[PDB]
Short mmCIF file of C-alpha atoms and ligand atoms in Angstrom, two decimals:
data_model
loop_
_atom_site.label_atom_id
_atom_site.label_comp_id
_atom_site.label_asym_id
_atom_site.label_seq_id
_atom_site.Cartn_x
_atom_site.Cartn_y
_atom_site.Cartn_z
CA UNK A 1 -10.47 -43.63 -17.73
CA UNK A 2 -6.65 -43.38 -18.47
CA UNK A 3 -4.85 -46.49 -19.44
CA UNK A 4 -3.54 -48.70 -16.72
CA UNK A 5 -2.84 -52.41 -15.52
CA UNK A 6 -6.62 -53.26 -14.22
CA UNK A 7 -9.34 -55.64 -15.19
CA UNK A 8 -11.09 -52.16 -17.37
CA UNK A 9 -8.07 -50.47 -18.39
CA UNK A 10 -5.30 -52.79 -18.48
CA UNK A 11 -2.92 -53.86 -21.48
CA UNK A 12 -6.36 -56.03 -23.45
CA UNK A 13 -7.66 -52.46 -23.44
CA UNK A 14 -4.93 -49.81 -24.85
CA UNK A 15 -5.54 -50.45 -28.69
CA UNK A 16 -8.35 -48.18 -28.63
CA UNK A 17 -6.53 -44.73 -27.49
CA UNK A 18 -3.18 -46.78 -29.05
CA UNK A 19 -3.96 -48.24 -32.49
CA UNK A 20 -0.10 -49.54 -32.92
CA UNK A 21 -1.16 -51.70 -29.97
CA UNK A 22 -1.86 -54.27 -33.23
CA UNK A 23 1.22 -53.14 -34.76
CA UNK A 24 3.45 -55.50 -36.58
CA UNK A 25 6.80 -54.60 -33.77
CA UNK A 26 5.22 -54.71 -30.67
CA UNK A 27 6.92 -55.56 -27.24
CA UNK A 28 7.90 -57.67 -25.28
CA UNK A 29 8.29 -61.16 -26.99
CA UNK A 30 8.39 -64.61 -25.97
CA UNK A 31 11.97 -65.40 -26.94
CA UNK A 32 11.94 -69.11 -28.13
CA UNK A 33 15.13 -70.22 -27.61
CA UNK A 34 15.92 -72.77 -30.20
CA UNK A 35 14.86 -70.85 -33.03
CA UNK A 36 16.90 -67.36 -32.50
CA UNK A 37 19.59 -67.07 -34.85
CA UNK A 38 22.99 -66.81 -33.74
CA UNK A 39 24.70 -63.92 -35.47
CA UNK A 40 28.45 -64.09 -35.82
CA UNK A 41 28.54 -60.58 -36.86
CA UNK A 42 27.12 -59.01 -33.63
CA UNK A 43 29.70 -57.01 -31.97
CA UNK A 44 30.25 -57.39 -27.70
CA UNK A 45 28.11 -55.21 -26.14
CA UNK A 46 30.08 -51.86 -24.62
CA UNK A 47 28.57 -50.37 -22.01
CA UNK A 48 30.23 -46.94 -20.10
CA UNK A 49 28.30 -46.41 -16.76
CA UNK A 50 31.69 -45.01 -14.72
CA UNK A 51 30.50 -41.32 -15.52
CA UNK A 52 26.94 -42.29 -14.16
CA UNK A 53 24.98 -38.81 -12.68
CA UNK A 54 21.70 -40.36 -11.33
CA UNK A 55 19.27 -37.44 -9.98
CA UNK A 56 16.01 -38.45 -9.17
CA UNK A 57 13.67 -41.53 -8.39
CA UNK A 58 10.01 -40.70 -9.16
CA UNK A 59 6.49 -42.76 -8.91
CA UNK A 60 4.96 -42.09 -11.96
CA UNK A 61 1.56 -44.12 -11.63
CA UNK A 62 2.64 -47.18 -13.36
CA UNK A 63 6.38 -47.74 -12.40
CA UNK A 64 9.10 -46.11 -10.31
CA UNK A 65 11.43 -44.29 -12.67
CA UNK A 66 15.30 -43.44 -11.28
CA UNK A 67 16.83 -40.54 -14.19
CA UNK A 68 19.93 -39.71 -15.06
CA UNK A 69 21.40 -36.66 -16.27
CA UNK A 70 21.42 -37.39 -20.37
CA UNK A 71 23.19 -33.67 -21.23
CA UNK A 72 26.58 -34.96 -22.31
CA UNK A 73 27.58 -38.46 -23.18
CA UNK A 74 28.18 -39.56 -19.41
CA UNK A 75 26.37 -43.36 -19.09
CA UNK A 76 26.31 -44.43 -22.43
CA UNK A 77 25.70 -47.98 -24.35
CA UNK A 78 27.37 -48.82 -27.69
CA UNK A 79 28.20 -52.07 -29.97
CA UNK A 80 26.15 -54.85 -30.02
CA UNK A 81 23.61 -54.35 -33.23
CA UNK A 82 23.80 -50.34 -32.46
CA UNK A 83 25.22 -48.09 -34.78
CA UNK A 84 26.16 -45.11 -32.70
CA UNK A 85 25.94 -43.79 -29.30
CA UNK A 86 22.94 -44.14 -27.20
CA UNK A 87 22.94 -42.24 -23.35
CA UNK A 88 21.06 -43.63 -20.72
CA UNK A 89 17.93 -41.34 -19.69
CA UNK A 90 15.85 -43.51 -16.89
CA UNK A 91 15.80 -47.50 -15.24
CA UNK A 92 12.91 -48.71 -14.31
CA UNK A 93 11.30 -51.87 -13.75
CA UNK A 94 8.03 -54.59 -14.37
CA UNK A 95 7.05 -57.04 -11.44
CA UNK A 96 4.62 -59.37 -10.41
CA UNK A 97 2.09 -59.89 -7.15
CA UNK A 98 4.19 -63.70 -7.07
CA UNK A 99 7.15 -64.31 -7.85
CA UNK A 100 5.95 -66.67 -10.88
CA UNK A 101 5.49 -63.74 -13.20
CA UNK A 102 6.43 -60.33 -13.12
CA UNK A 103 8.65 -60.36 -16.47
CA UNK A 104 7.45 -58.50 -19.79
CA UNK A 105 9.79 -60.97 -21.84
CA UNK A 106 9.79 -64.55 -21.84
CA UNK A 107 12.19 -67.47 -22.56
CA UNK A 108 10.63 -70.12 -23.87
CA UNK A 109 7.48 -69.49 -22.01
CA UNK A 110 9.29 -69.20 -18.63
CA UNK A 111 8.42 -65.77 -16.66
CA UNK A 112 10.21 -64.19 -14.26
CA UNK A 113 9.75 -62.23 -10.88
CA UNK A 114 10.63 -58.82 -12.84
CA UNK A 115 12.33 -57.53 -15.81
CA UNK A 116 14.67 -54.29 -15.80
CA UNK A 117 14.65 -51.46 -18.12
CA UNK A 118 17.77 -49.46 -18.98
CA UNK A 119 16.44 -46.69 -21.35
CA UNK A 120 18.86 -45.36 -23.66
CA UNK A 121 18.26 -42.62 -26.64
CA UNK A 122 20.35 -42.36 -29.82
CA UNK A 123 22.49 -39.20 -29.79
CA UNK A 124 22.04 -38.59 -33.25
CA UNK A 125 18.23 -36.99 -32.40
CA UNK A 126 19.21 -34.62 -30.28
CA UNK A 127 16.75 -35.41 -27.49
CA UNK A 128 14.47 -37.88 -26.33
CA UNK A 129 11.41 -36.64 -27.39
CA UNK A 130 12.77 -37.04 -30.98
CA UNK A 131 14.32 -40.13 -30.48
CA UNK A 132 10.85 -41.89 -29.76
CA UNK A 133 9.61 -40.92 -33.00
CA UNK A 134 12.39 -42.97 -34.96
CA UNK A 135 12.68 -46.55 -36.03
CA UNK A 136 16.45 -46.50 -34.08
CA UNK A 137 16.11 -44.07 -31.49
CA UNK A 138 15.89 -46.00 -28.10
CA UNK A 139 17.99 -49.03 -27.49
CA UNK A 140 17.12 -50.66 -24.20
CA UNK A 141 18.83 -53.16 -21.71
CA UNK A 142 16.36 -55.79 -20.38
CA UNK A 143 17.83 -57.90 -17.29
CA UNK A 144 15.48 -60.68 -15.60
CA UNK A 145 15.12 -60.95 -12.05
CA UNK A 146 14.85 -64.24 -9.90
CA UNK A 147 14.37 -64.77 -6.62
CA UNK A 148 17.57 -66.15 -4.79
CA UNK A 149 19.97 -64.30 -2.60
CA UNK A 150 19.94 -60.84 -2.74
CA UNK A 151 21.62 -58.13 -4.36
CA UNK A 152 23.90 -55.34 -2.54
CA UNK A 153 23.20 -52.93 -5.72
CA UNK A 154 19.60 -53.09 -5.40
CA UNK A 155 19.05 -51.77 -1.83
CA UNK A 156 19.73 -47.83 -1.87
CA UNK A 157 17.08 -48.24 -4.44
CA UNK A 158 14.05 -50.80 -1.96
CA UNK A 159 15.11 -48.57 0.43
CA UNK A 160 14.13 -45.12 -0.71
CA UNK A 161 10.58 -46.65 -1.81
CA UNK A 162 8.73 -45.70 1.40
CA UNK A 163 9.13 -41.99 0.12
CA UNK A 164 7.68 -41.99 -3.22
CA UNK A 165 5.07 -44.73 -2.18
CA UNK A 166 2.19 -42.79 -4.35
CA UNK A 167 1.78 -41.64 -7.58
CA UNK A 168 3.36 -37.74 -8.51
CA UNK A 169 6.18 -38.37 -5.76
CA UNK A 170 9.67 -37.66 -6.66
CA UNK A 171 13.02 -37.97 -4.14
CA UNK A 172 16.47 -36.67 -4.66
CA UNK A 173 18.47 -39.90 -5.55
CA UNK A 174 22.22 -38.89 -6.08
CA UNK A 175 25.06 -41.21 -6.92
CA UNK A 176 24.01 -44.37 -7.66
CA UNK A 177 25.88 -46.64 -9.63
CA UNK A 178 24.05 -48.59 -12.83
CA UNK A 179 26.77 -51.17 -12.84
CA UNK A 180 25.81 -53.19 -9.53
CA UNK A 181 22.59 -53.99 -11.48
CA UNK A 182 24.66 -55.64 -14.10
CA UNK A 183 25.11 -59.54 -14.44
CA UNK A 184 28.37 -61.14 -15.16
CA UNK A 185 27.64 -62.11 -18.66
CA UNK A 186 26.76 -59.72 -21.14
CA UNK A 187 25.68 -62.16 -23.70
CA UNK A 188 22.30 -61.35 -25.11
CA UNK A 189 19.18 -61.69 -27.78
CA UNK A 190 18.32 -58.70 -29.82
CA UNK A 191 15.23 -57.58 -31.95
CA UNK A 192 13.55 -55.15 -32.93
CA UNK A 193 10.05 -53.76 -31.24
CA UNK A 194 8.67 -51.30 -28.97
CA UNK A 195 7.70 -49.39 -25.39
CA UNK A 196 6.07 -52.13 -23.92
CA UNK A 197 3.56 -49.08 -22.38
CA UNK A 198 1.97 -46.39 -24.03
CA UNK A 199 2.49 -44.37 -26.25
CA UNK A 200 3.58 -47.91 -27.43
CA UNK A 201 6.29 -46.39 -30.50
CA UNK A 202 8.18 -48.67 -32.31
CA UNK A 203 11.65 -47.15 -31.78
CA UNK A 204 13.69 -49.91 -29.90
CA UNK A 205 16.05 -52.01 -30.48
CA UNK A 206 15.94 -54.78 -27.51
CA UNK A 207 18.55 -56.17 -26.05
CA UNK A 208 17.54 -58.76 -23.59
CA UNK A 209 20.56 -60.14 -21.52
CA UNK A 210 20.78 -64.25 -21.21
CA UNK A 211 22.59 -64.50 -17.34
CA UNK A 212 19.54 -62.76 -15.10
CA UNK A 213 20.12 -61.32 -11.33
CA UNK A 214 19.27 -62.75 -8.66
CA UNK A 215 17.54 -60.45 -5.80
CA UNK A 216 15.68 -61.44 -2.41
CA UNK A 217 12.29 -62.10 -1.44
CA UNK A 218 12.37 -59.57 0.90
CA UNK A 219 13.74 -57.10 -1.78
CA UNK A 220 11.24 -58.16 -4.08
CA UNK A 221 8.31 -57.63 -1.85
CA UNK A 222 9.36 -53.37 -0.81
CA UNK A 223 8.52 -53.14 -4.93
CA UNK A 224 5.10 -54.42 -3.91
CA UNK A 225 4.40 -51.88 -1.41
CA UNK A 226 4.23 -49.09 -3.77
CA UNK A 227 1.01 -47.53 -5.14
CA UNK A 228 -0.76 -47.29 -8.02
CA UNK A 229 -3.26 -44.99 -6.64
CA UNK A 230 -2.14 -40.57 -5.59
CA UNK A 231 -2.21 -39.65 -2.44
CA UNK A 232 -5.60 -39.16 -0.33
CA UNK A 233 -7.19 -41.71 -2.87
CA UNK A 234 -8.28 -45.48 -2.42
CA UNK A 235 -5.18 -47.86 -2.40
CA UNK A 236 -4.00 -49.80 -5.23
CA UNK A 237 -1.28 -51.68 -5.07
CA UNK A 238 1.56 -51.52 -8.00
CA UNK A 239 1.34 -54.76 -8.74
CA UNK A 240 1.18 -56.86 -12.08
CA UNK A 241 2.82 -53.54 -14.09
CA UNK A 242 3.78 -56.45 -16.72
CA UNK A 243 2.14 -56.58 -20.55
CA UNK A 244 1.86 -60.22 -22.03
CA UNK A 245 4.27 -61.19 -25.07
CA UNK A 246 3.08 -59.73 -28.33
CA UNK A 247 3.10 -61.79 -31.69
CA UNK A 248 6.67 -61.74 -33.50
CA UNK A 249 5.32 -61.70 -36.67
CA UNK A 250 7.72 -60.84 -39.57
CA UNK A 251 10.78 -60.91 -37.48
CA UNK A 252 13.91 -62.76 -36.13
CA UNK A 253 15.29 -63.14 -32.26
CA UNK A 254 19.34 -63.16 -32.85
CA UNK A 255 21.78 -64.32 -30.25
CA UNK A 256 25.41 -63.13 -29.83
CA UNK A 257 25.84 -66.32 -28.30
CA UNK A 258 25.42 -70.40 -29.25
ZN1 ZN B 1 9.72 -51.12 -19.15
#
């Protein structure tokens, strides 16, 4: 009975094996608009994909994971409310069975079809493992999807699904570039939180871009082809991977941007 996205196991569910489920930084957030603050002090976002070394692409039972090689300071994110360097380990993403929800985040209550993940750990720990278990180690890039014309980036990824359609898969996934995933703007809200799946840690720092991406219906639907379920076993489709916003509690939404 291992945590999951279903009607007995899904995200209503994890506070029993995940106490800081309740915690007082959880993720994601439903980012009301009108009251974030705009910071004048938050730096431009720098972000250094050229050096990019992408590896693998694996199905992992919940999402599909592409990793990057994170043993020298080759995709890295800096500025914006970081203080250091922080290399990129993984991408993935969060979708929805329609394309009215998918999104972890919110914007004043509007969902979208999916939400990406860049996952980036603060060189100061060493190594990701340690990284999770501070209050700064992970810094990562969300970017909405919505469904409109598509995007070139995206396809070497839709089109390598078919080969890691079940859980435990993996797929040699070599040279792709971060940057076509990237919107124009890099204006953005930041707080502080957590993994929006378990182990749940509240080591992020969020930063949620404004401008999202637009991608195809038809690119949209290869995500929901992909399954939940190992191979040999009954078929579940990855669908719905999404948690619902979290209380904000004690804490304040900035903008880098009015
Ligand atoms: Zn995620």
């Amino acid at each position: 009975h291992h945590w999951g996205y279903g009607k007995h196991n899904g995200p209503e569910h994890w506070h029993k094996d995940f106490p800081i489920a309740k915690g007082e930084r959880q993720s994601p957030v439903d980012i009301d608009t009108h009251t974030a603050k705009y910071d004048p002090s938050l730096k431009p976002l720098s972000v250094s994909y050229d050096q990019a070394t992408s590896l693998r692409i694996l199905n992992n039972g919940h999402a599909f994971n592409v990793e990057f090689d994170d043993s020298q300071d080759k995709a890295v994110l800096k500025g914006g409310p970081l203080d250091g360097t922080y290399r990129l380990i993984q991408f993935h993403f969060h979708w929805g069975s329609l394309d009215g929800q998918g999104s972890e985040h919110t914007v004043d209550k509007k969902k979208y079809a999916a939400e990406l993940h860049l996952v980036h750990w603060n060189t100061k720990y060493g190594d990701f493992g340690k990284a999770v278990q501070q209050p700064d180690g992970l810094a990562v890039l969300g970017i909405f999807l919505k469904v409109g014309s598509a995007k070139p980036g995206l396809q070497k990824v839709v089109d390598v699904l078919d080969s890691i359609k079940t859980k435990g898969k993996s797929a040699d996934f070599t040279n792709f570039d971060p940057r076509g995933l990237l919107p124009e703007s890099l204006d953005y809200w930041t707080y502080p939180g957590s993994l929006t799946t378990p182990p749940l840690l509240e080591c992020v720092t969020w930063i949620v871009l404004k401008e999202p991406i637009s991608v195809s219906s038809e690119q949209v639907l290869k995500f929901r082809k992909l399954n939940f379920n190992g191979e040999g076993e009954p078929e579940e489709l990855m669908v719905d991977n999404w948690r619902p916003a979290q209380p904000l509690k004690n804490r304040q939404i900035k903008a880098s941007f009015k």
